[PDB]
Amino acid sequence: GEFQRKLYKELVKNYNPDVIPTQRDRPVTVYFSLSLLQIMDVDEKNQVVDVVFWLQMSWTDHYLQWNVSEYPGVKQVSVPISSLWVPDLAAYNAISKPEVLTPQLALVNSSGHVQYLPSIRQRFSCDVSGVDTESGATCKLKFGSWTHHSRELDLQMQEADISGYIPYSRFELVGVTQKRSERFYECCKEPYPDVTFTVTFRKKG
Amino acid sequence: GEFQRKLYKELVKNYNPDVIPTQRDRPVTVYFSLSLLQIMDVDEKNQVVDVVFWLQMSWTDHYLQWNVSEYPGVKQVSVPISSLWVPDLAAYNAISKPEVLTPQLALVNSSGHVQYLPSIRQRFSCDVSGVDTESGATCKLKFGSWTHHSRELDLQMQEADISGYIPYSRFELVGVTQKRSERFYECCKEPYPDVTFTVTFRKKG
Amino acid sequence: GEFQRKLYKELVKNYNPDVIPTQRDRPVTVYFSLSLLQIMDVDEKNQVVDVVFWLQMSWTDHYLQWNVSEYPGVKQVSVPISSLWVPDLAAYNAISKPEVLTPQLALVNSSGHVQYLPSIRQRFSCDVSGVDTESGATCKLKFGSWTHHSRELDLQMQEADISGYIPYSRFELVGVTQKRSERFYECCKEPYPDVTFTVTFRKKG
Amino acid sequence: GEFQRKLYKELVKNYNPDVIPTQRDRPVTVYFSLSLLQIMDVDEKNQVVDVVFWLQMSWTDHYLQWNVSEYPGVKQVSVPISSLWVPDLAAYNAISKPEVLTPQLALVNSSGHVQYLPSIRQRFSCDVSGVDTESGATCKLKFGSWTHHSRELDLQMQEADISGYIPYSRFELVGVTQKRSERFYECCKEPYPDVTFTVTFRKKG
Amino acid sequence: EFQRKLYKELVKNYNPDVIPTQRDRPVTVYFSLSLLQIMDVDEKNQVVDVVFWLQMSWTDHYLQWNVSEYPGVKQVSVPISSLWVPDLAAYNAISKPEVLTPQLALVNSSGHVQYLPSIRQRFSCDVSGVDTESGATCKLKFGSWTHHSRELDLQMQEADISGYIPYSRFELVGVTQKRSERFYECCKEPYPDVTFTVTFRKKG
Ligand SMILES: CN1[C@@H](CC(=O)c2ccccc2)CCC[C@H]1C[C@H](O)c1ccccc1
Ligand SMILES: CN1[C@@H](CC(=O)c2ccccc2)CCC[C@H]1C[C@H](O)c1ccccc1
Ligand SMILES: CN1[C@@H](CC(=O)c2ccccc2)CCC[C@H]1C[C@H](O)c1ccccc1
Ligand SMILES: CN1[C@@H](CC(=O)c2ccccc2)CCC[C@H]1C[C@H](O)c1ccccc1
Ligand SMILES: CN1[C@@H](CC(=O)c2ccccc2)CCC[C@H]1C[C@H](O)c1ccccc1
Ligand SMILES: CN1C[C@](C)(O)C(=O)C=C1c1ccc(Br)cc1
Ligand SMILES: CN1C[C@](C)(O)C(=O)C=C1c1ccc(Br)cc1
Ligand SMILES: CN1C[C@](C)(O)C(=O)C=C1c1ccc(Br)cc1
Ligand SMILES: CN1C[C@](C)(O)C(=O)C=C1c1ccc(Br)cc1
Ligand SMILES: CN1C[C@](C)(O)C(=O)C=C1c1ccc(Br)cc1
Ligand SMILES: CN1C[C@](C)(O)C(=O)C=C1c1ccc(Br)cc1
Ligand SMILES: CN1C[C@](C)(O)C(=O)C=C1c1ccc(Br)cc1
Ligand SMILES: CN1C[C@](C)(O)C(=O)C=C1c1ccc(Br)cc1
Ligand SMILES: CN1C[C@](C)(O)C(=O)C=C1c1ccc(Br)cc1
Ligand SMILES: CN1C[C@](C)(O)C(=O)C=C1c1ccc(Br)cc1
C-alpha cells in the first residue's frame, strides 16, 4: 500500500534499533519459547549435540506503535530484524554460531508488538554419554540476555511444544522441561533471568 | 542504453524493497515452481537429503512498471534482487541455509512483471530409510512465505520440471508430484498458502 | 596520479554498475575464455568434479571511456568490480558457489575496454565414473549470462590455454575443447548463448 | 529512553571508533582475562587444540564518559562494539579466526568504562603430543595488541577462572597459569606487552 | 584530541581505490613471508596448508601529514579498508586467504604504511617427496594482480624462519625467496612477483 512506504520511511529516520525500549520503572518483557524440530546428531567424543529448533520471541516496543488513522489499511508489517531493536538473547552453552534457516523478518503490529519466529540450527556442549541407554542423555539448552538484567529485560517463557518434532528421527524424546530461573552473578547486584530447555533423549532400538 | 540509465535512477529515490507491492487490497500473486537437478546425497543416519534445484518465481510489482513510450528501446532490465521486493519464501523443512549458486539478479519488464530463477543447493529433513528399496524414499520439499498470508501474497504453482534432471546420478528419479495447499493456522485469522514438491527416488542397482 | 582521483570521482557521480552498456541495438560483446589450472578432486559417489580455473573476460563499456586530454597521464586504471558493470556469467552446472581466489578488480582503459581475470575454485556436476579408465572422464564446464540474451550480451570465445595446467596432478589431461552455442529455454523467447569447455581426463599409473 | 536516544545519537555524531582513546601522555589500560570453558578437540597429527573460552576485557575510554545531569536516568547502556573503539587484541599462535559465539555488545557506563565479555571458539597451534601421558599436554594461548605498543595500550591481566570448565569432557585440567610479559621486537623501538594463558591438560582414564 | 581530525581528513580527501603513484614513478612495496607452520599436506590432491606472516610496506604520499599541525602524533593504526593497499594475489593458492589478525596498518607522518597480516592459506604443491630425505618443495608465489612494475614496483625483504614452530611433524630442509619479473604475451608492460620456496620433510 501507499501508506506502507510512508510507514517504513519513518522507520529509517525516526527510530534507533540500538535502544532498548524500556519505559521508566518498567523493563521490556520478552516472551520466549523453543520448539525442538530435530536432533541432527551427537558427538560422544567431543560432547556436543546438534539441534534444529524453532524459537518464538515476542515483545512490545512502544517506539514501534503507529496511528491506524494515519496509515489506514496497515495493521501489521513484515520488517527486517536489522531495522528493529531485538533482545540480545544468547545461548549460554552453545559452541557454534547459530545458523538461521528462515527469512530474518519479524512481524510488527500498530501497538508496536513484535514477533520474531526463526528456525535455527546450532550445536551445544552436552554430556551425551547416556544416549544409548533407556534413561537417555539429558541436554540443557540455556538462554538469556547477554547484557540486560531483569529490571531492563524481563525474560518470560511461553509454553513449548514437541508437536513439531520429526517422527522418523533416530532419536526419541524421553522427556522435556522448560523453566525460567533468575540468578545473581558476582559483579552486579541485579539478577539475570534465564530460560532453560531440558531435553532427555535416546537412540531408537 | 542512455534512456535505460534514467530508468534505474527512479529505483533508488522512490522504491523500498522492504515493502510488499500489494495494490488496493489485492494480493501479490507469485507463481512458483521447482526443477530438480541432482540429489547430491542422502544421510541415512541423520535423515537428510541434499538437493540442487532451480526455483522459478514470478510476480507483478506495480511499482516497477514504466511508460515504454517514455523510455525508447528498453523492453526489460536486469536488477539486483537486493534492490527489489522479493517473496520471503522459505523451505519449511530445510535443515541448512540455501546456497544460491547463480547471480542474484531478476528480470523486470515494463509491465512490472518480475522473473527470478535461482539455482539452489539445500539440505532437507527427510525419511530416507527406504532409499535402497524398490519403493524407495519419498521426500517432501515444502515452501511458503514466512511472514505473509494469502490476502497479501497469493502463492500459486506452475508445472514442475524434471527434464533437467541429471541422468548419471546414483539415484533414480521414480516420480515427482507438486501440490498447493491454502491452510489456516491456530495463530492467525488468515490462511498461509504452501507449495509442496514430493520427490520419490531410489538407489540405482 | 592527481587525475585518477578526478577520474574515480566521475565514476561515482554518473555511472551505474547495474546498467548493461549496450548501444543502438548493439549488444555488448564479451570475449570469454577458461584456463584449467588444476583438477582438485573427484567424487565418484556423488558425481562431482572440483576445479581451479582462470577466467578471462573482456568487453568494451562505452560509458567508461575518457579523453586522454582531460586526464593527461592516465592510460588505464584498476577498479573494484563493484563499481563496474560486469557480465553476469553463471556456471550452469555448478553445484557449489564460486570461490574467487584473486582480488576483485578489473582493468579499464581510456577507450572503455575492460578486462576482468579472476582465478576461481568451484565444484561441478559431472559423470566422473570413467576416470580410472583409458577413455577417462569427460566434464563439461558450461558458462553463460544468467539474465541477458544474445541481443543484449554477445558472448564470444577466444583461444584456450592448457599451458597453465599443473603437471604434478594425479590427473592426466587428455583433451580440452571449447565451443559457443546458442540455445532456447522455457522462460524466454530469445536465445541465450553459452560457452562450454569440455575436459577429458584420467588417472595416471 | 528519551535520554538513551540522545546518548546513542551523540555516539554516532561525536565519536570515532577508529581512534584509540589515549590521553595526553597516558595510555589506555586494558584489563584482560581468559576463562576456559571446554577443550573441544586436539589434533595430534597437525598439532592443534580447539578451545571454547570466555574473554573478559575492560578499559576506560575517556571519550565515552557522559554527564549524568544531561542523561538523568541513564547509568549504563549496551552498545554494539562496531560503534566503539575496541582493543585490537590478537591471538598470536592462533591458526583459525575467532568464532564469536555471543552477542557483540559491550556495557558502557557514564565514566566511560567499557566491558566486553565475548564467548569464543578458536583453534591454536600447540604441542599436544603429551596429551595421553600423565604429565599432559601444555598449551600456551598468547594474546597481545597487534599494532599498539605499551605506551599507547597498556595490557594488564585479571584473576583467572576455571570454575566454568565443563566437568564432562574427555580432558581433565592439570595446571592453568596466566602471566604478563613485556617483550621487545627488532623492528620497533617500543616494547609490546602480552598476556599468556598456559593450560596443561590430559586425557581422562 | 588530534588523531580525531587526522581520520576526518582521511574521509573527505582520500580515495583508497587510487594507487599512490607520482609523476611517472611507481609505488615501491616491500614484501616478505615468514613461515610459521605447515599445518598439513594432501598427498592425493597435491596441496599444502600453511600459516604465515606477511610483511608489507610502502609509501603513500597522500598519507603524509605536517607534523606541526598534529603535535604528539607519531603513527596511527588505521583500518586497511580506509587505505590503498597493494592488490597482491597468491598465484597458486587454491583457497581464499584466511586472515588471522586485526586488519589494521600503521601509517606515520611520512606516509609510510606497514601492514603485517598473519594468514592461513592452502596452495597447489607437489608434495609427493615429503616422506623422502630430499623432501617436498613448494613454491609460494605472490604478485600484484592488476598493476605492472612501472606502477607497482614489488621488491623483496629477507624472509624469516625463526618464527617456525619447532614441534610439527615437518622439519625444514631449505628456504629461499626471489624477486622475478616477466612480460606476458597479453600486456605491454612487464609484471613482477616474489616467490617464497620451502623444502620440508616428515620427521622420525
Ligand atoms: C554475561 N554473564 C554476565 C556477565 C556479567 O554480569 C559480568 C561478569 C563478570 C564481570 C563483569 C560482569 C551477565 C549475564 C549473562 C552471564 C553469562 C555468563 O557470565 C557466562 C559466561 C561464560 C560462559 C557462559 C555464561
Ligand atoms: C536461467 N535461464 C534463463 C532464465 C532467465 O531469463 C532469467 C534468469 C534469471 C532471473 C530471471 C530470469 C536465462 C539463461 C539461463 C537459463 C537457464 C535455463 O532457463 C534453465 C533453467 C532451469 C532448467 C533448465 C534450463
Ligand atoms: C511461520 N509459520 C506461520 C505461522 C506464524 O507465523 C505463527 C505461528 C505461531 C505463532 C505466531 C505466528 C506463518 C507462515 C509460515 C509458517 C511456518 C510454520 O509455522 C513452521 C514453524 C516451524 C518450522 C517449520 C514451519
Ligand atoms: C606484530 N608484532 C609486533 C611488531 C610489529 O607490529 C611490526 C613488526 C615489523 C615491522 C612493522 C611492525 C607488534 C605486536 C605483535 C607482534 C607479533 C609478532 O611479530 C608475530 C608475528 C607473526 C606471528 C605471530 C607473532
Ligand atoms: C593476471 N596475470 C596478468 C593478467 C593480465 O594482465 C592480462 C591477461 C590477459 C589479458 C589482459 C591482461 C597480470 C599479472 C599477473 C598474471 C597472473 C597469471 O596470468 C596467472 C593466471 C592464472 C593463475 C595464476 C597466474
Ligand atoms: C517509529 N515510527 C515513528 C512515527 C513518527 O510514529 C510514525 O509515524 C511511524 C513509526 C513506525 C514505523 C514503522 C514501524 Br514497523 C513502526 C512504527
Ligand atoms: C551452562 N552454562 C551456564 C552457566 C552455568 O550459567 C555458566 O555460567 C556457564 C555455562 C556454560 C558451560 C559450558 C559451556 Br561450553 C558454555 C557455557
Ligand atoms: C518507480 N518508477 C517511477 C516512475 C516515475 O513512474 C518512472 O517513470 C519509472 C519507475 C521505475 C524505475 C525502475 C524500474 Br526497474 C521500474 C520503474
Ligand atoms: C514439513 N514441515 C512443514 C509443516 C508441516 O508446515 C510444519 O508445520 C513443520 C515442518 C518441518 C518439518 C521438519 C523440520 Br526439521 C522443520 C519443519
Ligand atoms: C563517468 N565518466 C564520464 C565522464 C563524464 O566522461 C568523465 O568525466 C569520466 C568518466 C569516467 C570515470 C571513471 C572511469 Br574508470 C572512466 C570514465
Ligand atoms: C548442464 N546444465 C546446462 C543446461 C543444460 O543448460 C541447463 O539449463 C542446466 C544444467 C544443469 C544440470 C544439472 C545441474 Br545439478 C545443474 C545444471
Ligand atoms: C561521545 N559522547 C559525546 C558527548 C557530547 O559528550 C555526550 O553527550 C555523550 C557521548 C557518549 C555517547 C554515548 C556513549 Br555509550 C558514551 C558517551
Ligand atoms: C606465540 N608466538 C609469539 C612469539 C613467541 O612472539 C613469536 O615470535 C611467534 C609466535 C607464533 C607461534 C605460532 C604461530 Br602458528 C604463530 C606465531
Ligand atoms: C588526506 N590527508 C591530507 C591532508 C588533507 O593534507 C591532511 O591534512 C592530512 C591527511 C591525512 C589523513 C589521515 C592520514 Br592516516 C594521513 C594523512
Ligand atoms: C604459480 N602460477 C603462476 C604462473 C607460473 O605464472 C602461471 O602461469 C600459473 C600458476 C598457477 C599454477 C597452479 C595453479 Br592451481 C594456479 C596458478
* CB neighbour burial string for C76-103, b if at least 16 within 10 angstroms, e if fewer: bbbbebebbbbbbbbbbbbbbebeebbb
Q: Are B156 and B194 in contact (CB under 8 A)?
A: no
Helix (H) or strand (E) holding A132: none
In degrees, to the nearest 5, what angle opens at C-alpha D157 toward C-alphas D156 and D162? Answer: 170
Strands E27-42 and E152-156: parallel
At position D5, the amino acid (one-letter code) is: R
Query: Of A5, A8, A40, which has the smallest distance from its Cβ to B95's Cβ?
Result: A40
In angstroms, the Cα distances linking E202 to D132, E128, E140, E173, E199 are 22, 12, 19, 10, 11
The strand ranges marked E within chain E are 27-42, 47-59, 75-79, 88-90, 98-99, 104-108, 112-115, 118-124, 136-144, 152-156, 170-183, 190-202
Q: Which of B33, B85, B82, B78 is nearest to B62 (CA)?
A: B85
At position E136, the amino acid (one-letter code) is: A
Beta carbons within 10 angstroms of residue C115's beta carbon: 18
Separation of first and last alpha carbons in chain A = 56
Q: Which of B125, B136, B119 is nearest to B172 (CA)?
A: B136
Query: What domains appear along chain D, each with residue ranges and CATH number?
Result: 1-205 (2.70.170.10)
Q: Are A113 and A58 in contact (CB under 8 A)?
A: yes
Grid cell, residue D203, equals 586425557
Beta bridge partners of A202: A172
Inter-chain residue contact A96 with D99, CB threshold 8 Å? yes
Question: How many Cα atoms occupy the beta-carbon half-sphere of A94 within 13 Å?
Answer: 26
Is A168 within 8 Å of chain B by CB? yes
Q: Are D115 and D132 in contact (CB under 8 A)?
A: no
Strands E88-90 and E136-144: antiparallel
Query: Of C18, C146, C147, which has the smallest distance from its Cβ to B8's Cβ?
Result: C18
In degrees, to the nearest 5, what angle opens at C-alpha C49 toward C-alphas C47 and C51? Answer: 170
DSSP class per residue in B180-203: EEEE--SS-SS-EEEEEEEEEEEE
* Integer Cα distance of D168 and A127 in angstroms: 6
Grid cell, residue A176, equals 522435556
Grid cell, residue E204, equals 622420525
Is E161 within 8 Å of chain D by CB? no
* Integer Cα distance of A28 and A87 in angstroms: 9
* Integer Cα distance of A162 and A170 in angstroms: 16
Rounded to 5 degrees, φ, ψ at B121 are -110, 130
Query: Of E15, E21, E89, which has the smallest distance from its Cβ to C103's Cβ?
Result: E89
* CB neighbour burial string for A106-126, b if at least 16 within 10 angstroms, e if fewer: bbbbbeeebbbbbbbbbbbbb
* Integer Cα distance of E19 and E60 in angstroms: 8
- A93, A183, A194, A198: which to mutate for ligand 7, most atoms within 8 A of CB? A93
Q: Which of B19, B30, B84, B97 is nearest to A118 (CA)?
A: B97
Residues of D with Cβ-Cβ distance to E54 under 8 angstroms: none
3-state secondary structure of D33: strand
* Integer Cα distance of B179 and B172 in angstroms: 22
Q: What chains are in contact with A, requiring at least 3 Cβ pairs below 8 Å?
A: B, D
Rounded to 5 degrees, φ, ψ at E99 are -80, 125
Resolution value (Å, 1 decimal): 2.2
Helix (H) or strand (E) holding D34: strand D28-43
Question: If you ran DSSP here, which 8-state letter would residue B62 be given?
Answer: G
Q: Which of B106, B143, B18, B156 is nearest to A104 (CA)?
A: B18
Sorted by sequence, the CB contacts under 8 Å of residue A191 that are 6+ apart come out as A149, A150, A182, A183, A184
Question: If you ran DSSP here, which 8-state letter would residue C130 be given?
Answer: T
Q: Are E147 and E24 in contact (CB under 8 A)?
A: no
Q: Which residue has the cell 592461513?
A: E120
Grid cell, residue A46, equals 567431543
Rounded to 5 degrees, φ, ψ at B24 are -85, 95
Q: Which residue has the cell 592459506?
A: E121
Question: If you ran DSSP here, which 8-state letter would residue E8 be given?
Answer: H
Residues of B with Cβ-Cβ distance to C44 under 8 angstroms: none
Taking CA atoms only, the protein residue closest to ligand 3 atom 20 is B92
Beta bridge partners of D146: none
Taking CA atoms only, the protein residue closest to ligand 5 atom 2 is E145
* Integer Cα distance of E173 and E133 in angstroms: 9
Sorted by sequence, the CB contacts under 8 Å of residue C196 that are 6+ apart come out as C140, C141, C142, C143, C178, C179, C181
Question: If you ran DSSP here, which 8-state letter would residue C81 be given?
Answer: G
Q: Which of E36, E102, E109 is nearest to E66 (CA)?
A: E109
Taking CA atoms only, the protein residue closest to ligand 12 atom 17 is D64
Cβ burial of C27 (10 Å; 0-12, 13-18, 19+) is middle
Residue of E nearest to D147 (CA): E77
Beta bridge partners of C171: C203
* Integer Cα distance of A92 and B167 in angstroms: 47
Q: Are C121 and C94 in contact (CB under 8 A)?
A: no
Grid cell, residue C1, equals 596520479
Length of chain C: 205
Taking CA atoms only, the protein residue closest to ligand 8 atom 17 is B64
Sorted by sequence, the CB contacts under 8 Å of residue B89 that are 6+ apart come out as B30, B32, B55, B57, B143, B144, B145, B146, B155
At position E53, the amino acid (one-letter code) is: W
Cβ burial of D200 (10 Å; 0-12, 13-18, 19+) is middle
* Integer Cα distance of B98 and A10 in angstroms: 32
Q: Which of A32, A38, A51 is nearest to A125 (CA)?
A: A51
Q: Are C47 and C128 in contact (CB under 8 A)?
A: yes
Question: If you ran DSSP here, which 8-state letter would residue A159 be given?
Answer: P
Q: Which residue has the cell 523500498?
A: B16
Rounded to 5 degrees, φ, ψ at B65 are -100, 155
Grid cell, residue B193, equals 498458502
In angstroms, the Cα distances linking A142 to A93, A184, A199, B7 are 6, 15, 11, 52
Beta bridge partners of A78: A107
* Integer Cα distance of C55 and B101 in angstroms: 17
| Torsion region of E111: left, alpha or beta (phi above 0 gives left; psi -120 to 50 gives alpha) | left
- C101, C166, C170, C171: which to mutate for ligand 15, most atoms within 8 A of CB? C166
In degrees, to the nearest 5, what angle opens at C-alpha A42 toward C-alphas B125 and A50? Answer: 55
Q: Are B3 and B72 in contact (CB under 8 A)?
A: yes
Separation of first and last alpha carbons in chain C = 56
Q: Indicate if the alpha-carbon torsion angle D147, D149, D150, D151 is positive or negative.
A: negative
3-state secondary structure of C119: strand
* Integer Cα distance of C85 and B63 in angstroms: 24
Q: Are D89 and D157 in contact (CB under 8 A)?
A: no
Experimentally determined by: X-ray
* Integer Cα distance of D25 and B90 in angstroms: 57
Query: Of C20, C95, C146, which has the smallest distance from its Cβ to B103's Cβ?
Result: C146
Closest CA of chain C from B70, distance in Å? 17
Helix (H) or strand (E) holding C4: helix C4-14
Query: Of A100, A105, A169, which has the smallest distance from its Cβ to B147's Cβ?
Result: A105
Distance of CA A130 to the CA centre of its chain: 27
Rounded to 5 degrees, φ, ψ at B30 are -110, 125
Cβ burial of B145 (10 Å; 0-12, 13-18, 19+) is buried
Q: Are B141 and B199 in contact (CB under 8 A)?
A: yes
Distance of CA D182 to the CA centre of its chain: 17
* Integer Cα distance of C120 and C55 in angstroms: 8
Grid cell, residue A56, equals 518464538
* Integer Cα distance of C143 and D52 in angstroms: 43
D70-73 CB contacts, 8 Å cutoff, 24+ apart: D70/D3, D70/D6, D71/D3, D71/D4, D71/D6, D71/D7, D71/D110, D72/D3, D73/A24, D73/D1, D73/D3
Beta carbons within 10 angstroms of residue E160's beta carbon: 17
In angstroms, the Cα distances linking D87 to B26, B124, D103 are 53, 42, 17
Beta bridge partners of E15: none
Q: Which of D108, D5, D117, D8 is nearest to D57 (CA)?
A: D117
3-state secondary structure of A83: helix
Q: Which residue has the cell 540455556?
A: A142
Residues of B with Cβ-Cβ distance to A4 under 8 angstroms: 19-20, 22
Question: If you ran DSSP here, which 8-state letter would residue E193 be given?
Answer: E
Q: Are E31 and E157 in contact (CB under 8 A)?
A: yes
Inter-chain residue contact E21 with C5, CB threshold 8 Å? no
Helix (H) or strand (E) holding D5: helix D2-13
E-proximal residues of D, 36-75, CB under 8 Å: 45-48
Is D79 within 8 Å of chain A by CB? yes
Grid cell, residue E90, equals 597468491
Taking CA atoms only, the protein residue closest to ligand 9 atom 13 is B93
Beta bridge partners of A155: A30
Rounded to 5 degrees, φ, ψ at A4 are -60, -45
H helix runs in chain E, sequence order: 3-12
Is C147 within 8 Å of chain B by CB? yes
3-state secondary structure of D192: strand
* Integer Cα distance of B87 and B190 in angstroms: 18
DSSP class per residue in B70-121: TSTT-SEEEEEGGGS----EEETTBSS--EE-S--EEEEETT-EEEE--EEE
Taking CA atoms only, the protein residue closest to ligand 9 atom 11 is B93
Sorted by sequence, the CB contacts under 8 Å of residue D160 that are 6+ apart come out as D33, D34, D35, D176, D178, D197
Q: Which of B44, B57, B52, B50 is nearest to B166 (CA)?
A: B52
Q: Are E142 and E93 in contact (CB under 8 A)?
A: no
At position D192, the amino acid (one-letter code) is: Y
Length of chain A: 205
* Integer Cα distance of E130 and B13 in angstroms: 61
Q: Which residue has the cell 599444502?
A: E48
Grid cell, residue C147, equals 539474465
* Integer Cα distance of B18 and B108 in angstroms: 17
Q: Which of C124, C96, C95, C112 is nearest to C34 (CA)?
A: C124
Strands A48-65 and A99-100: unpaired
Question: How many Cα atoms occupy the beta-carbon half-sphere of C24 within 13 Å?
Answer: 0
Grid cell, residue B101, equals 549458486
Beta carbons within 10 angstroms of residue E98's beta carbon: 14
In degrees, to the nearest 5, what angle opens at C-alpha B14 toward C-alphas B10 and B18? Answer: 120
Closest CA of chain D from A146, distance in Å? 7
Q: Which of A4, A9, A12, A16 is nearest to A76 (CA)?
A: A4
Q: Which of B188, B148, B107, B122 is nearest to B20 (CA)?
A: B148
